[PDB]
């Protein structure tokens, strides 16, 4: 299925995912498509950050849902 991922510039990218994807695997797919390491990615739905070890299914995220991607340089 396809989902949308909106960025802080308003750019929306389309990503092919499965409901069975962990959020970590969604970030790996963003890394494959766009070259950004998962450690630099914050994924947001309903205004609250998604947890790496849950799935899109666990959030009831469906085809053409729109997530938010915020980039951050890794923590110290």
DSSP string of 11-43, one letter each residue:
-EEEEE--TT-BHHHHHHHHHHHH---GGGEEE
* Among candidate residues 63, 29, 23, the one with its CA nearest the CA of residue 44: 23
Q: Centre a 10 Å sphere on the Cβ of residue 17 and count the other Cβ atoms it contains.
A: 20
- Separation CA 50–CA 42 (nearest Å): 8
Supply φ then ψ for residue 22, to 5 degrees.
Answer: -65, 155
Specify the experimental method. Answer: X-ray
Give the H/E segment covering residue 63: none
Structure tokens given for 28: 């790996």
- Separation CA 23–CA 52 (nearest Å): 5
Are 26 and 65 in contact by the 8 Å Cβ rule? The answer is no
- Separation CA 55–CA 36 (nearest Å): 20
Q: For residue 29, how many C-alpha atoms fall within 13 Å in the half-sphere facing its CB? A: 18
């Amino acid at each position: 299925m396809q989902i949308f991922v909106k960025t802080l510039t308003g750019k929306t990218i389309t990503l092919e995912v499965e409901p069975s994807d962990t959020i970590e695997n969604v970030k790996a797919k963003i890394q494959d498509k766009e070259g950004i390491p998962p450690d630099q990615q914050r994924l947001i739905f309903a205004g609250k950050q998604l947890e790496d070890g849950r799935t899109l299914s666990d959030y009831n995220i469906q085809k053409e849902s729109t997530l938010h991607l915020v980039l951050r340089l890794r923590g110290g």
